């Protein structure tokens, strides 16, 4: 539950900047990442 609310507020946040790269948490171990899409 706390991880879900943390990743909610770290994403697109609401109107202000009060509280609001390695390590690539955002699925970026690039090996057939873009290549597994058909790219044609």
């Amino acid at each position: 539950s706390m991880k879900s609310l943390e990743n909610e507020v770290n994403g697109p946040l609401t109107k202000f900047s009060t509280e609001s790269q390695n390590d690539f948490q955002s699925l970026k171990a690039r090996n057939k990442f873009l290549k597994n899409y058909i790219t044609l």
């Binding site: 948490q25 699925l27 970026k28 171990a29 090996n31 057939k32 990442f33 597994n36």
Partner: protein, 613 residues
């Protein structure tokens, strides 16, 4: 009170490993409990147990109901199910600790694949590499790595589609092979002793010739050490010639090592001499295989200090040090390992492409059977030689063949003259098929017919034997025929020689003055007829043309003057470049196979005529 001999699957091995890793400055956790602050070289991954949804993906409902019911049984019911299954043990405290291995593997693999971490080491018991999908077995409750792989394959069909799984445990990974024998997106390779029933488990799915089935064909490789006692160079050669090229061929998205250290040095169950540096080198190559996607789990291990040093070296190479040097490079492995490796490379070349045109295999196509029918284009060569030689001796001297009833053999395997029972004097030659002197085209594997120098050395004695009007008994043994692969020329030579002496020689009315001529390594069969029977009343002398083969020890079983008579009545010509009482008068020749035959044909036949007088 079996505490002096505990079963070697106990919880303290993980404590030994965690002790060693803290003892070499890797872990900054003194208390040896699971904390989060480990330090700077590693990151502790948390762990949750496996839910039902992910565990029903490869395992059935019935097995899950079985393991769910066996949590709260009695004492005697758990003991009865422990003796019911094949080398397992249940417990009251067994169900929730059998849902943590799959979760630990899944969390390590997801932290690698999502790129939170480079490589993962998951020290986890119980083992999970023997269990079938419907039933447990061999101290394995849930097949962990298959759960993890299928869970990745469903939960990440956008960055992972091909997974290579290796097993260097000395036991064959039965259930994890059986779970993927029909899948094409997963490669499995194992290294184990097989031995057909002697070692665990010893069934047909441990044999190497199982490659896969259906559309998942050609995604399963087995390397069977035929005898225990291998060392470093066997593993190094097996990695260099088999593992790495097929790995670079397959282009893996993810590599799963299922490590079992039971084949290490100093063990009792496996009995090998694997130093940890060989593990370091094989992990170095496997790190080099894909881009770095490595999960390392644990299956075996039954001796504490050895698994400690081994896991120390594996942690050292997985964190970044080079693997250390080897204890002895001049090692020169065992030859039967080499011939079975060649046998692997044959069928791998039938399935893959990276063994044709680099191991002399692109000539024939093995995907059709070696056949005598018109369905397949390939035809064996022994049939042609015996067919032509049979036709030649049929037009010349009208030689009968001797049929072998109750023996699954080809028809004209052994030859005789007609009225061989009334032939008063019989010469029994046992020869081998000849060796050819040509050039082999080293890429295609073929030979050239123009430079084909082939000589039938065995026929000339018959050309002597027809001059004496002697009865002729010719024996040819095929050297394994290349088709059945379980064939042995030795024991089948013993079969036909014992069969001849008991079945036909003891019933000839005119049997008298038997000589024996053995050529090549076939003569050992004569040894089996000479150490196990008493033929010396009718037979007179024995001749061997060994050459450069190893020596044949005749040990008698019924008497002891058999060895003395065999020492007296034998002429065994050998190689001049061989240099090496119970062997029966081995004689070093002078020039050199066929050269010593033309050199000592005269001396052998004069000795036979003098012994026959």
């Amino acid at each position: 009170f079996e505490y002096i001999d505990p079963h070697p699957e106990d919880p303290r091995r993980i404590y030994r490993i965690y002790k060693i890793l803290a003892e070499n400055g890797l872990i900054n956790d003194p208390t040896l409990s699971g904390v989060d602050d480990l330090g700077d070289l590693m990151l502790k991954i948390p762990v949750r147990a496996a839910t039902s949804e992910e565990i029903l993906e490869v395992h059935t409902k019935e097995h899950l109901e079985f393991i769910e019911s066996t949590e709260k049984m009695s004492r005697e019911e758990l003991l009865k199910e422990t003796e019911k299954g094949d080398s397992v043990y249940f417990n009251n405290d067994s169900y929730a600790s059998a849902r943590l291995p799959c979760g630990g593997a899944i969390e390590a693999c997801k932290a690698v694949v999502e790129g939170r971490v480079k490589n993962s080491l998951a020290v986890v018991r119980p083992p999970g590499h023997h269990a079938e999908p419907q039933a447990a077995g061999g101290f394995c409750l849930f097949s962990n790595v298959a759960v993890a792989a299928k869970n990745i394959l469903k939960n990440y069909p956008e960055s992972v589609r091909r997974i290579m799984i290796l097993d260097w445990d000395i036991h064959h990974g039965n259930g994890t092979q059986k779970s993927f024998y029909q899948d094409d997106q997963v490669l499995y390779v194992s290294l184990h002793r097989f031995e057909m029933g002697k070692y665990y488990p010893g069934t047909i799915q441990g044999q190497y010739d199982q490659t896969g089935e259906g559309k998942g064909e050609g995604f399963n490789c087995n390397i069977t050490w035929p005898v225990g006692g291998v060392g470093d160079a066997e593993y190094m050669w097996a990695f260099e010639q088999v593992v790495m090229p097929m790995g670079r061929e397959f282009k893996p998205d993810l590599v799963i090592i299922s490590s079992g250290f039971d084949a290490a040095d100093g063990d009792t169950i496996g009995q090998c001499h694997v130093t940890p540096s060989c593990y370091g080198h094989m992990t170095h190559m496997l790190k080099s295989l894909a881009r770095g996607n490595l999960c390392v789990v644990l299956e075996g291990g039954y001796n504490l200090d050895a698994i400690a040093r081994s896991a120390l070296s594996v942690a050292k190479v997985l964190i970044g040090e080079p693997p250390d040097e080897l204890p002895d490079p001049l090692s020169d492995p065992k030859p039967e390992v080499i011939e079975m490796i060649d046998k692997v490379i044959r069928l791998q070349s039938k399935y893959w492409n990276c063994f044709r045109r680099r191991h002399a295999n692109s000539g024939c196509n093995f995907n059709e059977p070696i056949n005598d029918s018109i369905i397949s284009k390939n035809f064996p060569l022994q049939k042609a030689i015996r067919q032509q030689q049979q036709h030649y001796l049929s037009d010349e001297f009208n030689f009968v063949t001797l049929p072998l009833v109750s023996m699954d053999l080809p028809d004209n395997t052994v030859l005789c003259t007609p009225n061989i029972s009334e032939s008063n004097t019989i010469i029994i030659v046992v020869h081998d098929t000849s060796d050819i002197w040509a050039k082999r085209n080293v890429i295609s594997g073929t030979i050239d017919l123009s430079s084909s120098v082939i000589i039938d050395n065995s026929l000339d004695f018959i050309k002597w034997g027809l001059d004496r009007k002697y009865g002729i008994i010719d024996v040819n043994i095929p050297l394994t025929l290349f088709e059945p692969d379980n064939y042995s020329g030795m024991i089948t030579s013993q079969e036909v020689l014992i069969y001849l002496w008991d079945n036909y020689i003891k019933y000839f009315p005119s049997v008298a003055k038997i000589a024996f001529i053995g050529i090549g390594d076939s003569y050992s069969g004569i040894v089996h007829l000479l150490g196990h029977r008493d033929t010396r009343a009718v037979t007179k002398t024995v001749i061997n043309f060994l050459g450069d083969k190893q020596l044949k020890p005749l040990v008698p079983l019924v008497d002891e003057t058999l060895s003395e008579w065999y020492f007296k009545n034998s002429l065994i010509f050998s190689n001049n470049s061989h240099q090496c009482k119970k062997f029966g008068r081995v004689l070093r020749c002078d020039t050199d196979l066929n050269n010593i035959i033309e050199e000592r044909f005269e001396e052998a036949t004069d000795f036979i005529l003098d012994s026959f007088e």
